[PDB]
Paper text:
The T-antigens encoded by polyomaviruses are multi-domain, multifunctional proteins that form hexamers and double hexamers at origins of replication. The topology of the JCV OBD is a five-stranded antiparallel β-sheet sandwiched between two helices on either side.
The JCV OBD (residues 132–261) crystallized in three different forms that were termed form 1, form 2 and form 3. The four structures are very similar; a superposition of the four JCV OBD structures revealed root mean-squared deviations (RMSDs) of less than 0.5 Å. JCV OBD region B3 (residues 216–220) is poorly ordered in crystal forms 1 and 2, but well ordered in form 3. This loop is also poorly ordered in several of the SV40 OBD structures. To better understand how the JCV T-ag OBDs may assemble during oligomerization, we examined the interactions among the OBDs within the three crystal forms. As described in this section, the largest interface between adjacent molecules is the same in all three crystals. To extend these analyses, we examined the interactions among OBDs within crystal forms 2 and 3. In addition, crystal forms 2 and 3 also formed a right-handed tetrameric spiral (data not shown).
Residue numbers in the entry: 133 to 259
Write the structure that this text describes.
């Protein structure tokens, strides 16, 4: 109805728009509701054994950002997430700039809510 159809525009810079790609990657984002995100935060951590995952607020919606040990098609992460949704929207894309995306999601108009690693994510954990 008035559900979003993509991520907020300030994050497009960070996201891959080719959702049907055969290329397998290791960082992902999910834009959905507080409720759905609260659950996926725990499910994803267990299904993908994420090396890291965080949940961020934006009005009433949430954005999950997570890294995985092994690579996966964006298509696959999405399919898994969508099975938890019926009427709630949910957008899932691949993330290119890991530490920068995570940065933007830690500042206005966004904010961190919960993380799987204290202090969160440090810049030196990347190239």
């Amino acid at each position: 109805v008035e559900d979003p159809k993509d991520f907020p525009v300030d994050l497009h810079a960070f996201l891959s728009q080719a959702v049907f790609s055969n290329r397998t990657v290791a960082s992902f984002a999910v834009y959905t509701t507080k409720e759905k995100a609260q659950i996926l935060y725990k499910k994803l951590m267990e299904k993908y054994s994420v090396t890291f995952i965080s949940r961020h607020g934006f009005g009433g919606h949430n954005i999950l950002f997570f890294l995985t040990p092994h690579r996966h098609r964006v298509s696959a992460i999405n399919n898994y997430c969508q099975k938890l949704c019926t009427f709630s929207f949910l957008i899932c894309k691949g993330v290119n700039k890991e530490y920068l995306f995570y940065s933007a999601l830690c500042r206005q108009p966004y904010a961190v809510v919960e993380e799987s690693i204290q202090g969160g994510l440090k810049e030196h954990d990347f190239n």
